[PDB]
Amino acid sequence: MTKVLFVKANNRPAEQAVSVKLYEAFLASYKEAHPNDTVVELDLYKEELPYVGVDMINGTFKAGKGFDLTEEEAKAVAVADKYLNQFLEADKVVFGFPLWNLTIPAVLHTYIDYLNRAGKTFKYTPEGPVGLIGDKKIALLNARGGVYSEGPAAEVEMAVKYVASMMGFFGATNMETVVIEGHNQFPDKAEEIITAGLEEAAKVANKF
Amino acid sequence: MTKVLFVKANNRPAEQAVSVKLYEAFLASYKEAHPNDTVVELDLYKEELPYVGVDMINGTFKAGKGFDLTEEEAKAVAVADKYLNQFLEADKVVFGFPLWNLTIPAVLHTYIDYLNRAGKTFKYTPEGPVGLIGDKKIALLNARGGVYSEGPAAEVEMAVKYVASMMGFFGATNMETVVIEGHNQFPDKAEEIITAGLEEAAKVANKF
Ligand SMILES: [Cl-]
Ligand SMILES: [Cl-]
């Protein structure tokens, strides 16, 4: 069966978080369109996500070489490996996140840090890195209260741009992006903006 | 006495991390120039930095209003408050960080998340937010192995740009930035690049 992983990075209620409403609608539409696919949800707010530091950096280096590790190094590699393996095994991955403080939630930042692994998501070559996830389909789902595609905030969008950039580095192509934006900044258009976004979400989900 | 806070976000050894070498040289130069200033180091890798989620978001909202909180909400606010208060009390703050995966370490991302607080680092007004840290001097110290000021990576620098953007939102002005870049990409120039950077660090530190 096709394996689809949904990575959710917002534990606020749907009633208050358009990004969660977006995620839920895409999820529901995907399941309706493809009921035989094995869909798994990874809720990053239910996971233990130790931060990447020296133990995880040295650890992954040593692990890759088959060298001895401290217990703390081994534990760090094992955490990263769990998520990385699940991500690699997925045929399709859907990221659902808000824009908070110009970027993604720090939980998703740590998750992405785990996915960067030589020999797994990219490889070094004498002419530069080559991404290894070319076959994997990725969808990015973001809601943000202000507009970031134009105007004074356009140069500081670091949420979608962040995720897209790292996925591109890993070799992902033809990614789908659904953005709902502006509903808090233009409150009189909030209902229209979200409705349109949720319809877009269902269309994308049906082709994804 | 003037109060200076150094926020360190890299637990790799100086011998291997130019960003740590940079931080240490700026620190040493600052202390030599201003030995009577009270300098405190906050090493984010020694701190417990719970991620920002619904408890911390609801919690801070409720706290601000003087409303009742769950124990988990109260604990989240208290963590954020500890760091926020220390940051507010500092006359000067120095951030030392690498560029990893296009951005700052996730520990520093969570730290910055804590600093965003209505009534503390900014205020809402009927004509938009006004930053409240205009009097605070900020220095940003970054090292990165590749070049991000020009070339194919220039559009994806999200480490300095991230920190600068949030500090600017809080109302910081005339910030000092010291960047050492390119030493891994141009290894034959690594010694020259780092030496020049450490000299720049000492100059800035003497005026800071
Ligand atoms: Cl560590
Ligand atoms: Cl939470």
* CB contact B52 to A (< 8 Å): yes
**Residues B11/B15/B19/B25 CA torsion (nearest 10 deg):** 110
**What is the whole-number distance in angstroms between the Cα of residue A203 and the centre of ligand 2?**
32
Q: What is the 3-state secondary structure (H, E, C) of chain B?
A: CCEEEEEECCCCCCCCCHHHHHHHHHHHHHHHHCCCCEEEEEEHHHCCCCCCCHHHHHHHHHHHHCCCCCHHHHHHHHHHHHHHHHHHHCCEEEEEEECECCECCHHHHHHHHHHCCECCCEECCCCCCEECCCCCEEEEEEEECCCCCCCCCHHHCECHHHHHHHHHHCCCCCCEEEEEECCCCCHHHHHHHHHHHHHHHHHHHHHC
Amino acid at B65: K
Q: Do B6 and B41 form a contact (C-beta atoms < 8 A)?
A: yes
| B116: containing domain | 2-208
B162 by DSSP, 3-state: which?
A: helix
Burial class (CB in 10 A: 0-12, 13-18, 19+), A186: middle
What is the C-alpha to C-alpha distance for residues B143 and B98, in angstroms, rounded to an integer?
5
Q: Tell me the CATH number at B60.
A: 3.40.50.360
* CB contact B164 to A (< 8 Å): no
Technique employed here was: X-ray
Q: Name which of A12, A51, A107 is nearest B57 (Cβ-Cβ).
A: A12
Chain-centre distance of CA B164, in angstroms?
9
Q: What resolution in angstroms, rounded to 1 decimal?
A: 1.8
Element housing A178 (H / E): strand A176-181
* CB contact B124 to A (< 8 Å): no
Report DSSP state, residue B158. Answer: B
What is the C-alpha to C-alpha distance for residues A201 and A199, in angstroms, rounded to an integer?
5
Please count the structural domains in chain A: 1
* CB contact B123 to A (< 8 Å): no
Count of other CB atoms within 10 angstroms of residue B184 = 14
Nearest-Cα residue of chain A relative to residue B100? A113
**What is the whole-number distance in angstroms between the Cα of residue A73 and the centre of ligand 1?**
8
For chain B, give percent helix, strand, coil, nearest 5. 45, 20, 35
